[PDB]
Design a protein around this ligand. Structure first.
Ligand code: A1D6R
Ligand code: NA
Lengths: 537, 119, 86
């Protein structure tokens, strides 16, 4: 319980009391404090600390090297390192759990992590502590990746260690070096393709809430690994797909332009050469439609998107799906004897053409443009649209009330006046479009006020804000594009899951170090050469 | 003073204008083919040709276009919706995009333009 | 060749070994190492160093004032400065 669950040790250690623990364990102190206190539970709503059920966890989350050394090297009761807590976190899991993203916390967390690992190595050198799982199912790496901790991930993937006595547990196995040049082999064991949660699979298919989802792909091996995959086997496939889609749109446009016009919908087939080509075109178009619909359904049913990330983490997918939906509705109408299918087909064709921009992500300098237009169709344009709509509606209803038409005559309808003011907005309007009014002064004053407030004031305001936003978000757009490219590389490699997988495996099977057991360390390493002129050691 | 101007116009005829031209061309072609499909001309009459409609949309772009240039269509709602969507996406969104990017590029490359002129 | 053309001096100096060269040239050390090793060739694709065929070049490209002074002011075999490479 809260204070019936807190053993002497928890609150004991809490106040940095070495002497007290000395005594308490000299006589004997239990090291299995099942503190589930609402204060000390995982519950985030409760203001407290999830240092960990076990007391070693409490010593660790706090900057106490002495106690973390002592509790484990104390003559007896060296609390079992593989101590699954309520949620399952081992000591390292808790250490990752507490870590924040501030620099000082980076120092603290990484520094401790290393030392605890080496102590565990010495203690019982058969337990692979970094693979122990948690309730949800996640290794320490998986957690650092999902929750989002730049520092911890950086350390683990660049975890270079020394003191050969036991150095198997490292990442950056250095190789031949000759002057200012030096090779280097990374590990890439649980990064690319294996387990149930790879690092490069939880950094991309992750919600937008995770902090710096788009900044963790610059660590060290991830970046070059993705680019090596791209330059080798995910370049030709993407271009061929682009070609196929561009051909499909052309066939659809050809089928649409030559639509027969004579009679109500279901149209019989002639026996001319052209009429067969038309039917073929129609069949291909509907096939494309069904394909896209099923793709959308699968996407939505497997990677469940939330209501907020619906339009923040999936924009291309939604548009693909909606285009497919319009196509299918057109088809269902066309067979029901209704000539309203032209509208659905037209909308489908327009959106299909505008959807080519999904392929700009293969080229560096246009993906940025596409992402920028995305951001400012969700950031800057909506607000301006709303305010301008209020202005237009107000002035249009005013003028329509003023107009008389008791005699360019049917200008009473609100629609006509609204259209005239919009025409004012697009630089074609007329300042004397009607004369039926009864007071010229009021009409001119309203028109001039509208022109001042919308044409000259709001539009230049929008230009100013767009300039400011651009100068703010150039870099953010770049990063978003990088993440988008990573998404597509993963998707393309997966899509051939059934076709082939062997060739789709980066790295090379190297063997550099050895294990304390006395065996080899067969690891899939990947070279990254470097040159330095100041280290010189 | 003027060599810098010439070099700047070169840089932005090889950097900024090409991309905008491509994207705008995609938009124009898509909406023009959509509208041309919608049009009927089963009765300002020979508006079936793709060329005439493309020219009309470009006229929209240069601030002279007309929002009721033809009446042969069969559904007014669809025609107006397409025209308004085009106007929102090209006239008000992309052009001010290009203004913003041109300003940013100028602020970035004043010095580069000077150096290129010296060379 | 790569390691057959690599003379004792090249790898010798490489590790900042004064004493060693002292001895090696005290008895005598050739200063005409024709190291054309793919690693040590002008080839940029090969990750290595083009410090230069002769070993004085190796001493020079690396921050070794001592050896560049020595190899030329050593009692004998002051490697011909005008030593055209490959
Ligand atoms: C797979 C995919 O689309 N990727 C991307 N598309 C775009 C983009 O294109 C659009 C087009 C439309 C649209 C809406 C309605 C209509 C109609 F009038 F027909 F109803 C037509 C078009 N809305 C939003 N975006 C603009 C900017 C960035 C990107 S990224
Ligand atoms: Na104008």
């Amino acid at each position: 319980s809260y204070y019936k669950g807190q053993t002497a040790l928890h609150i004991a250690i809490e106040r940095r009391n070495m002497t007290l623990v000395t005594l308490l364990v000299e006589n004997g102190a239990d090291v299995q404090a099942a503190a589930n206190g609402d204060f000390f539970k995982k519950t985030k709503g409760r203001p407290g600390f999830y240092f960990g059920e076990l007391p070693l966890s409490l010593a660790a989350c706090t900057n106490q090297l002495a106690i973390v050394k002592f509790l484990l090297q104390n003559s007896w009761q060296p609390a079992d390192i593989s101590a699954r807590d309520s949620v399952g976190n081992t000591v390292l899991h808790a250490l990752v759990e507490v870590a924040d993203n501030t620099v000082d916390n980076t120092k603290f967390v990484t520094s401790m992590y290393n030392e605890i690992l080496i102590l565990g190595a010495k203690l019982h050198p058969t337990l692979k502590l970094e693979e122990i799982t948690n309730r949800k199912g996640l290794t320490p790496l998986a957690l650092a990746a999902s929750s989002g901790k730049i520092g911890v991930l950086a350390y683990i993937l660049q975890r270079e260690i020394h003191e050969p006595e036991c150095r198997h547990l490292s990442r950056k196995f250095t190789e031949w070096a000759y002057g200012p040049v030096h090779s280097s082999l990374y590990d890439l064991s649980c990064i690319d393709t294996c387990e149930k949660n790879s690092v490069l699979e939880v950094i991309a298919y992750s919600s937008s809430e995770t902090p710096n989802r788009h900044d963790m792909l610059l660590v060290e091996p991830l970046n070059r690994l993705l680019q090596d995959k791209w330059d080798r086997f995910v370049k030709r496939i993407f271009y061929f797909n682009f070609f196929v889609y561009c051909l499909y749109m052309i066939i659809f446009t050809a089928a649409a332009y030559y639509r027969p016009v004579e009679g109500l919908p279901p149209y019989k087939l002639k026996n001319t050469v052209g009429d067969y080509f038309r039917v073929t075109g129609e069949i291909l178009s509907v096939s494309g439609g069904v394909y896209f619909f099923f793709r959308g359904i699968q996407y939505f049913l497997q990677r469940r998107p939330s209501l907020k990330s619906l339009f923040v983490d999936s924009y291309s997918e939604i548009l693909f799906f909606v285009q497919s939906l319009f196509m299918l509705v057109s088809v269902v109408l066309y067979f029901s004897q209704r000539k309203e299918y032209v509208a659905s087909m037209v909308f489908s064709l327009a959106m299909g053409w505008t959807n080519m921009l999904y392929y700009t992500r293969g080229f560096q300098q246009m993906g940025i443009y596409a992402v920028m237009i995305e951001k400012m169709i969700l950031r800057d344009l909506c607000r301006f649209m709303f305010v301008y709509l209020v202005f237009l509606f107000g002035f249009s209803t005013a003028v329509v009330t003023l107009i008389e038409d008791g005699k360019g005559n049917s200008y009473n309808s609100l629609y006509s006046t609204c259209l005239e003011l919009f025409k004012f907005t697009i630089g074609m309007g007329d300042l004397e479009f009607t004369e039926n009014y009864d007071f010229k002064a009021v009409f001119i004053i309203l028109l001039l006020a509208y022109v001042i407030l919308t044409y000259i004031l709001l539009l230049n305001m929008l230009i100013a804000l767009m300039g400011e936003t651009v100068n703010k978000i150039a870099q953010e757009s770049k990063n978003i594009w990088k993440l988008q490219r990573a998404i597509t590389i993963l998707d393309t490699e997966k899509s051939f899951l059934k076709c082939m997988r062997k060739a789709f495996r980066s790295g090379k099977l190297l063997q550099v170090g050895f294990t304390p057991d006395g065996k080899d360390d067969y690891r899939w390493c990947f070279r990254v050469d470097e040159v330095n002129w100041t280290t010189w050691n």
